[PDB]
Every structure is written in structure tokens, then in C-alpha cells.
Design a protein around this ligand. Structure first.
Ligand SMILES: [Mg+2]
Ligand SMILES: [Mn+2]
Length: 254
């Protein structure tokens, strides 16, 4: 049983889905153009409702957190990180664990580093702490949504309508590529050493969007972190291999 609602946070009405009665609060952070509805169905359904209280939020401009429309200023990951934590605080949780996917994992890393007393544990996958030429090329190949597979386009087209979906994807590409021009193509390399909570980095070895060196790098600089490789996992491993992933996550969080 899942409840959808909005809460006022930093000038925006953020949408989120909540389920479970557990004492361990968990926030699910979606990736680019994502939402709880499109990125975390299996988790909102199967994560242990007795152990956890699960919340899946929609970053401003994504999912149902519209208005406003999405924009990508240089600090957009930090803005999302603040919104995410403020949302959970608005919902009265005293401490929470984070499950972040891709852009959501980058967001989770930032939140753990900036608000260490609020984060218990963290599980991230498909995230990159910086942008390289190889990444830039990958992003460019994603820009045109019309060339996306029909299966991956359907859900987002239905949620946003073609126009917003196409336009926001282009702004995302320009928004994430902007980091390549900064020293070290940095997004959050500098915050990794500041993560103080136990972290589990999962990586699908067949992920075509995020080279494994990004997971190795995050693992290297996040003290006490654990890295788990899934031979058959791709970028959407928590969806394609939901049962396997959920077990990995639940075991780590306990
Ligand atoms: Mg450097
Ligand atoms: Mn939503």
C-alpha cells in the first residue's frame, strides 16, 4: 500500500510516495528525468515494510514535482541534495538511509557528505563523481529521445508528454556536460572523502552508460565503503534484477 502526496520544501511542492511502517527510514533517489513512479516500483512494492518506511521522491521539475520545470544550474546536484534531506525532515524522520540511482546516487553522496549526522547508511549504483570525455560522448548519444528504444521512451513520454520529455533530456545533457569544463571534470570527487556513513556501491558490469572505473573511484575514496559487482547487471539493475538487488540492499541496511 503506497501513498502519494506533496510537501512544501524550499519553495517547491515536491511529490513523493511512501509505504511501510518500519523504524528504519529509507529514501529512494531517482536518476535523470526520474520519479518514484518510473524508477522504484519494485522497491516501493517489495522492500520489507516491517523493517522500513520507504519514501520515493520526485526532484523538482521531475515526476510530479511540477511546477517548477527542470533547469540545471551548476549546483543542481547540491540543490537536489538539500531538497531531498529537507523533504525527509519535513516528513519528520530523524535519520534516514539513502538508496540512490545514477544522478540520484550522486545526489545521495552529496547529502551524506553535507549532512552526515542525518544519514545512517547508503546504497548507490550507476553513479559517477566526475565527467570524462568518454562520459560526454555517452551523454551526447542520449540527447535525442526519439532515438531511444521504444521500451525506455514509453514510460517517460507518458509521464511528461513528448515535448517536456525531449526538451528536458536535452537540458540534462547540457547540464551534466557542463562539469567536464571544471577542474577535474568534477561533480563531487571532493565530497567523497567527507562521507562518514557505511556505503554500498553496486555496479552492473554490463552497464553501457557508466564505465566501471566510476564505481571503482567512488569505492576508493568513500572510506569503509563496499563495492559489489553484478556480472549481468546493466544500468537498470534494480529493476531487471529487483529481487537480487533488494536482498543486497536490505542485508546491507540492517
Ligand atoms: Mg585531477
Ligand atoms: Mn510522483
Amino acid at each position: 500500500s503506497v501513498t502519494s502526496a506533496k510537501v512544501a520544501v524550499n519553495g517547491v511542492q515536491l511529490h513523493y510516495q511512501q509505504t511501510g511502517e518500519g523504524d528504519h527510514a529509507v529514501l529512494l533517489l531517482p536518476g535523470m528525468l526520474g520519479s518514484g513512479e518510473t524508477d522504484f516500483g519494485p522497491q516501493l512494492k517489495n522492500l520489507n515494510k516491517k523493517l522500513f518506511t520507504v519514501v520515493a521522491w520526485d526532484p523538482r521539475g521531475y515526476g510530479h514535482s511540477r511546477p517548477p520545470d527542470r533547469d540545471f544550474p551548476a549546483d543542481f546536484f547540491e540543490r537536489d541534495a538539500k531538497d531531498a534531506v529537507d523533504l525527509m525532515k519535513a516528513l519528520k524522520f530523524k535519520k534516514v538511509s539513502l538508496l540512490g540511482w545514477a544522478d540520484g546516487g550522486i545526489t545521495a553522496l552529496i547529502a551524506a557528505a553535507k549532512y552526515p549526522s542525518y544519514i545512517h547508511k547508503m546504497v548507490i549504483w550507476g553513479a559517477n563523481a566526475y565527467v570524462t570525455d568518454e562520459d560526454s560522448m555517452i551523454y551526447e548519444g542520449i540527447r535525442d529521445v526519439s532515438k531511444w528504444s521504444e521500451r525506455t521512451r514509453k514510460p517517460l513520454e507518458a509521464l511528461y508528454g513528448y515535448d517536456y520529455f525531449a526538451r528536458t533530456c536535452e537540458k540534462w545533457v547540457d547540464g551534466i556536460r557542463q562539469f567536464k569544463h571544471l577542474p577535474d571534470g568534477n561533480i563531487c570527487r571532493h565530497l567523497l572523502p567527507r562521507v562518514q556513513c557505511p556505503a554500498l556501491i553496486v555496479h552492473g558490469e554490463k552497464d553501457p552508460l557508466v564505465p566501471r572505473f566510476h564505481a571503482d573511484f567512488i569505492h576508493k575514496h568513500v572510506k569503509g565503503s563496499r563495492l559489489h559487482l553484478m556480472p549481468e547487471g546493466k544500468h537498470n539493475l534494480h529493476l531487471r534484477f529487483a529481487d537480487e538487488f533488494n536482498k543486497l540492499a536490505e542485508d546491507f541496511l540492517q
